[PDB]
Design an enzyme around this catalytic site. Structure first.
Site, PDB file in Angstrom:
ATOM      1  N   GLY D  13      40.087  41.453  37.505  1.00 24.86           N
ATOM      2  CA  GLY D  13      40.780  41.567  36.109  1.00 24.86           C
ATOM      3  C   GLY D  13      41.301  40.280  35.630  1.00 24.86           C
ATOM      4  O   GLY D  13      42.139  40.503  34.699  1.00 24.86           O
ATOM      5  N   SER D  15      39.259  37.872  34.196  1.00 30.40           N
ATOM      6  CA  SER D  15      38.533  37.730  33.254  1.00 30.40           C
ATOM      7  C   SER D  15      37.696  38.619  32.797  1.00 30.40           C
ATOM      8  O   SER D  15      37.819  39.786  33.329  1.00 30.40           O
ATOM      9  CB  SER D  15      37.451  36.453  33.723  1.00 30.40           C
ATOM     10  OG  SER D  15      36.632  36.844  34.625  1.00 30.40           O
ATOM     11  N   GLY D  18      37.553  43.131  33.098  1.00 30.14           N
ATOM     12  CA  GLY D  18      38.637  43.429  33.810  1.00 30.14           C
ATOM     13  C   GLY D  18      40.129  42.817  33.031  1.00 30.14           C
ATOM     14  O   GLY D  18      40.859  43.538  33.062  1.00 30.14           O
ATOM     15  N   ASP D  36      42.432  39.382  42.315  1.00 29.82           N
ATOM     16  CA  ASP D  36      41.272  38.295  41.605  1.00 29.82           C
ATOM     17  C   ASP D  36      41.331  37.347  42.709  1.00 29.82           C
ATOM     18  O   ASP D  36      42.504  36.993  43.284  1.00 29.82           O
ATOM     19  CB  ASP D  36      41.386  38.142  40.321  1.00 29.82           C
ATOM     20  CG  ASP D  36      39.772  37.825  39.854  1.00 29.82           C
ATOM     21  OD1 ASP D  36      38.878  37.577  40.696  1.00 29.82           O
ATOM     22  OD2 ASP D  36      39.610  37.724  38.460  1.00 29.82           O
ATOM     23  N   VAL D  60      37.879  40.887  47.756  1.00 31.36           N
ATOM     24  CA  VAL D  60      37.482  42.341  48.095  1.00 31.36           C
ATOM     25  C   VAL D  60      36.408  42.570  49.018  1.00 31.36           C
ATOM     26  O   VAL D  60      35.840  43.699  49.285  1.00 31.36           O
ATOM     27  CB  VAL D  60      37.150  43.127  46.652  1.00 31.36           C
ATOM     28  CG1 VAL D  60      38.267  42.863  45.604  1.00 31.36           C
ATOM     29  CG2 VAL D  60      35.897  42.686  45.953  1.00 31.36           C
ATOM     30  N   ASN D  86      36.477  46.670  39.564  1.00 31.67           N
ATOM     31  CA  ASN D  86      35.852  45.877  38.645  1.00 31.67           C
ATOM     32  C   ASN D  86      35.224  44.594  39.046  1.00 31.67           C
ATOM     33  O   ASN D  86      34.553  43.719  38.509  1.00 31.67           O
ATOM     34  CB  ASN D  86      36.373  45.671  37.398  1.00 31.67           C
ATOM     35  CG  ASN D  86      36.044  44.482  36.368  1.00 31.67           C
ATOM     36  OD1 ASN D  86      34.824  45.059  35.717  1.00 31.67           O
ATOM     37  ND2 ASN D  86      36.289  43.420  36.109  1.00 31.67           N
ATOM     38  N   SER D 139      26.611  49.470  35.263  1.00 34.25           N
ATOM     39  CA  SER D 139      26.074  48.474  34.479  1.00 34.25           C
ATOM     40  C   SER D 139      24.879  49.385  33.761  1.00 34.25           C
ATOM     41  O   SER D 139      24.296  50.456  34.622  1.00 34.25           O
ATOM     42  CB  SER D 139      25.418  47.182  35.010  1.00 34.25           C
ATOM     43  OG  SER D 139      24.667  46.705  34.132  1.00 34.25           O
ATOM     44  N   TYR D 152      21.191  42.710  41.755  1.00 36.55           N
ATOM     45  CA  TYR D 152      22.250  43.262  41.066  1.00 36.55           C
ATOM     46  C   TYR D 152      22.099  44.784  40.709  1.00 36.55           C
ATOM     47  O   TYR D 152      22.964  45.626  40.941  1.00 36.55           O
ATOM     48  CB  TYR D 152      22.353  42.306  39.805  1.00 36.55           C
ATOM     49  CG  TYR D 152      23.486  42.839  38.891  1.00 36.55           C
ATOM     50  CD1 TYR D 152      23.327  43.807  37.891  1.00 36.55           C
ATOM     51  CD2 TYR D 152      24.808  42.360  39.106  1.00 36.55           C
ATOM     52  CE1 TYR D 152      24.025  44.231  37.120  1.00 36.55           C
ATOM     53  CE2 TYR D 152      25.677  42.802  38.236  1.00 36.55           C
ATOM     54  CZ  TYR D 152      25.735  43.629  37.078  1.00 36.55           C
ATOM     55  OH  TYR D 152      26.686  44.012  36.520  1.00 36.55           O
ATOM     56  N   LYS D 156      24.365  48.023  41.733  1.00 34.70           N
ATOM     57  CA  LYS D 156      25.058  48.671  40.915  1.00 34.70           C
ATOM     58  C   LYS D 156      24.517  50.257  40.900  1.00 34.70           C
ATOM     59  O   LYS D 156      25.380  51.131  40.608  1.00 34.70           O
ATOM     60  CB  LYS D 156      24.767  48.190  39.473  1.00 34.70           C
ATOM     61  CG  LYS D 156      25.405  47.278  39.228  1.00 34.70           C
ATOM     62  CD  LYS D 156      26.749  47.130  39.699  1.00 34.70           C
ATOM     63  CE  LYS D 156      27.638  46.001  39.025  1.00 34.70           C
ATOM     64  NZ  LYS D 156      29.021  45.853  39.606  1.00 34.70           N
TER      65      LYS D 156
END
Lengths: 250, 251, 248, 248
Positions: D13, D15, D18, D36, D60, D86, D139, D152, D156
């Site tokens: 969060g 950037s 987030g 972050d 994370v 996020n 996404s 990716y 997702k």
């Protein structure tokens, strides 16, 4: 011969997808009743194919004719194993401004209400037999926009919903329901499909769809039910606009 | 007030989900036209809420009345920003044997053909304005079977398809289309049922909750949301709990 | 014989769904390479079926073994028409509290990363040939919750997404990608009570038949499809109907 | 102020999406913990916003740090109402040939395994409280191909599956789980050409507003939903219409 002894009704089967399914259903040993309003094609096709293939005039907007069609196949072949509800009318992409209420209700009556009656009367003969398959022709438009008219798309979504409810109710009696959703089923039409299709080097024909109905109708799908099976070469899974713009400017 | 100055038409808005959306739409500053065949509820509701809320009798099976409804809102308030096509009739789980052709066509005419006409005439006034949103009431049955009648389910799928075609055609003019699919909207007899049936516990779905979701989709907080059938079902549609129930019962 | 002349790789094909697909693929005339870590089952099965069925030890978490597996089938049979990425490990329904990071990464590596490598190396040999089919084994859990563990479900969703991206990229070269998602492949009485479609029990043999369809030229225009074999289980939440019927 | 008194954790969060959710969450009265690896942005943002916004360094991929992050917010504000998972890394459209195993596993670890740990530790504090909301950033690629890289996309999809399993398990305790799938968050001229809905450019601030909806009691009965913010992009393949139109 993947349906030896089976009995099939094909509504809207004198032309197009229905006619190739009838021929295929026949090569694999099914008894088939053709149900259509195209009395000239329907009877000629039924006469060319032999004794196990007979034609019966049925307007699928008229419940009396539908009930007569199912009652007569049960009188003649002893039961109905496969109902292929294929009757319908098509609409290319249009505007919501183009939609006329009278024409919307006419299309809903053939595409959607005809499928209810086909289903309702097949179920009536299949449930006491504890077996059967109902297949509907939907369209790739049930998965992606931009390839069919507004009225046509709504009626084809309704068929998916009807098919999934049927899959639940009739599952209790051993009966399967499924849909097949084709995409892009002369010369002016090949070159566009060659430009439009996601999967290249392969043009969708009616014969290809008939093969997919053969799968869903047979005991090779004996546990397949509630499925709207797309035959679209992947067209519905991609919006290629973003990739086209990155590539065009770069 | 999340819709100050905006103009909303709510078909089927004298009772149920439509009536709570009208009240909510009103609290947040919209001008609202109620369109219903329940002339007594419709006019009483419009009279209690104030000047910005007026009632107009409209059978949404009749294109002439629909055309008049949209033309008159554009005559009085200058344009239509929100069309909430909420009119329809309901049908609980039934059999394909129960389906009568006359009743099927009657339901298709109110649920599905009424939505086409609502859409067709809102688009007619919104496209030259290059803004607007159309919201349809679908149902959680569009995502999972076993909670609605066959005829009702088919008509509600048709609405999803119509909504997605609209989202494409009208996006080119700035116009959004979306659906909201609720689940769960002898009062107590039905409440204890939903307490047993719901996936998400400690929370009962009311009409007021749905109205809040329509408020989101109608507002500029969803200014880029389009083509979405938004479920309000506490997760009911994502689970078939039968398998887990049988493993737990025998063990 | 619906694949006479075709060449098929079946990862995870010494037991279960993979083993019945190998047998079926064989009855219909395919050349098949079995790829598994169960070296004893894999080799016994390959020896029982004949010359066109051979076994090769491949851990699908190891890209070097995967690359060798595809290179050797292309050395031996001239190309690869069908990749059936079937290797994976299973998890019944569990809690998010049960999830251990080490176990999660071990499962992601076999189920999901093994599918990437299978795909990446099949595509490497198929694209210059301008034909081929990639099939993944996903699971009915990709359509409905409550029948598989959290880690397993996430890895099987990832496979669907990978399959659909592949369907786009490889469609340009004539190559198809699809998934098959079975359901419910002591235990019979469970499925007899649990299944939506009655009077029919799902076996591994039934799934093999569905892979046969997607692999064959009867699906020559089918691509991007996660085909469910679940008797309708995923389309219904019967809780509401059960409560109306119980109290009435 | 639609979340007065609520406590929110926003991983990733400092950037992007987030950071705008943090600002929004703050304007509407939430207490927010920023988590972050961008220690410089994260701490500057937390210092600019006031006392209810604090920063905590959390990778994370490391369960010890995630566990510490949740334990400290519960030590400091008494509980966790909202987990906004996020954190993640992005990949534009690429080839299956581009996929490197080490890179795939690095992406899976941040995008997918980071979401498991975020979920597992939020659930650990929310279940005994019998309330809470978990939101994931997925996404638009989870609904349509051709807008994101293979690795990716798979990660997702896994998040959607994890979110739907969570929605079932945690619904029994009052807890909601949902995803938000944005699309298109030089580059604006591209989006002006690419978007289905015209006259409107998607910003990070727009997404933050959609997370605000799902996090609040205006979605008190919304759970299991992957909510797309894509202006309709995912519902159309316009290729067919483009080829007809050029000829007509």
């Amino acid at each position: 011969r993947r349906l030896e002894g089976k009995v099939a009704i094909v509504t809207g089967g004198a032309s197009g997808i229905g006619a190739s399914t009838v021929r295929l259903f026949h090569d694999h040993g099914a008894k088939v009743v053709i149900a259509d309003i195209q009395d000239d094609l329907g009877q000629t096709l039924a006469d060319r194919l032999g004794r196990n293939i007979s034609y019966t005039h049925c307007d699928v907007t008229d419940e009396d004719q539908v009930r007569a069609l199912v009652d007569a196949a049960v009188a003649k072949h002893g039961g109905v194993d496969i109902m292929f509800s294929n009757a319908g009318i098509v609409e290319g992409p249009n505007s919501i401004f183009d939609v006329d209420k009278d024409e919307l209700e006419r299309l809903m009556g053939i595409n959607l209400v005809g499928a209810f009656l086909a289903a309702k009367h097949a179920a009536r003969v299949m449930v006491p037999a504890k077996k059967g398959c109902i297949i509907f022709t939907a369209s790739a438009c049930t998965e992606i926009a931009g390839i069919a008219g507004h009225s046509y798309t709504a009626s084809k979504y309704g068929i998916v919903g009807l098919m999934k409810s049927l899959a639940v109710e009739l599952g209790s009696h051993g009966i399967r329901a499924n849909c097949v959703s084709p995409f892009g089923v002369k010369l002016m039409f090949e070159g566009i499909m060659s430009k439009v299709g996601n999967l290249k080097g392969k043009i969708l024909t009616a014969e290809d769809v008939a093969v997919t109905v053969l799968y869903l109708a047979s005991e090779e799908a004996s546990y397949v039910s509630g499925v709207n099976l797309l035959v679209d070469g992947g067209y519905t899974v991609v919006n290629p606009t973003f990739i086209n713009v990155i590539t065009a400017g770069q």
